[PDB]
Structure 1
């Protein structure tokens, strides 16, 4: 009813597409840290940024 234009809809779907990439990126970083790590880098020795 309010803001019936197409631009509002494209915004909604544009976030849905972009949101998925952000979700998938979170899976890589969290899986990378959990699984892929140096032979000596314990979870309490990995840097603060990681």
Structure 2
């Protein structure tokens, strides 16, 4: 129903841009866990970092 070659490029491009999101989530999740300043507990970090955590 969609014989065009553009649709395959769409699929593959979507897939690739989705790898970058997991690649970014991996180190945006473990930076919070591991690398924090002395005194910066989980409940001291700003709302922005909580949102990126979730």
**TM-score in terms of structure 1 length:** 0.91
Which structure 1 segments of 5+ residues have no match? none
Aligned residues: 49
Which structure 2 segments of 5+ residues have no match? 50-54
Which structure carries more relative contact order (alpha carbon 8 Å, separation 6+)?
2
SS at structure 1 position matched to 2:8: helix
* Off by >6 Å, runs of 4+ in structure 1: none
CA distance in 2, matches of 1:37, 1:31: 10
**TM-score in terms of structure 2 length:** 0.85
* Aligned-residue CA RMSD (Å): 0.6
